[PDB]
């Protein structure tokens, strides 16, 4: 219903219909608020190919970046008190194995 002539003086200007003409079986599906079949500058198959290719390429390269991460030439951060054992979970009645950090 979108691609009917917008300049004709219809009896129903919003729906672009005339009193008396047969109504399409699926009129409520084409009401300019819903799916429209108006011609596009680009062909449907070309648009499908381009959109699918773009999305697939982005997914592929995100996975590739996952496989090959990016980082800085540094070691892991060092935290003082047994890798901050007590402040993360606690359990102060177990005497954890001491881990200490080497000064360079």
């Amino acid at each position: 219903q979108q691609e009917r002539d917008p300049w004709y003086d219809w009896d129903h200007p919003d729906l672009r219909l005339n009193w008396g003409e047969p109504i399409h079986w699926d009129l409520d599906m084409y009401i300019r608020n819903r799916v429209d079949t108006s011609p596009t500058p680009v062909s449907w198959n070309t648009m499908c190919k381009h959109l699918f290719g773009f999305v697939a390429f982005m997914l592929f390269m995100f996975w590739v970046g996952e496989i090959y991460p990016s980082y800085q030439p540094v070691g892991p951060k060092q935290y003082p008190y047994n890798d901050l054992y007590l402040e993360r979970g606690g359990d102060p009645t177990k005497e954890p194995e001491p881990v200490v950090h080497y000064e360079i």
Partner: protein, 175 residues
């Protein structure tokens, strides 16, 4: 506040730093809180004094109902409808009380998490542990009974749990 018991809802003694300003520039927070006090807290205080003296002029009391203990579903015959009715009502009352206990422990946990700031993962271990214990006990008592729960179904659940316990203990002792 004397309204609620401090032991049921414990709170740490609330240590606060003293104001130790380092510069002679006057901070607007103290001026703003002083004008807020003079302009809001005083009239509200006077209104509350009036309301409280009016309430004191007419003092009357309400009481908390006391419920006598009644034999439970274990010492009730199979079809004795009156004993079953009384035991079932008692069981429902106990269920509601246990719900309220779990609610109290949850309130404790939430208050601890809010109050301890950034060190909540460490400073709220006691509340988390007591909630874990209470949650386990409540789950053992009342879970999976269904929409049509009753005292008989709770007793059956307990009986099968203790059959499992007796079997496991017998196996361990004779292992």
């Amino acid at each position: 506040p004397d309204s609620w018991d401090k032991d049921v809802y414990p709170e740490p003694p609330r240590r606060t730093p003293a104001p130790a300003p380092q510069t002679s520039l006057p901070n607007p927070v103290t001026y703003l809180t002083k004008i807020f006090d003079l302009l809001v807290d005083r009239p509200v205080t006077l209104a509350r004094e009036f309301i409280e003296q009016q309430h004191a002029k007419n003092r009357y009391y309400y009481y908390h109902r006391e419920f006598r203990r009644v034999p439970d579903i274990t010492e009730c015959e199979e079809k004795d409808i009156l004993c079953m009715f009384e035991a079932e009502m008692q069981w429902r009352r106990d269920y509601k009380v246990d719900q309220e206990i779990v609610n109290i422990i949850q309130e404790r946990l939430k208050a601890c998490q809010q109050r301890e700031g950034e060190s909540y993962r460490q400073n709220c271990a006691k509340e988390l542990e007591q909630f874990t214990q209470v949650s386990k006990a409540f789950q053992d008592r009342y879970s999976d009974l269904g929409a049509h729960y009753s005292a008989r179904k709770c007793l059956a659940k307990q009986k099968q749990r203790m059959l499992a316990e007796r079997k496991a203990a017998k196996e361990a002792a004779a292992a």
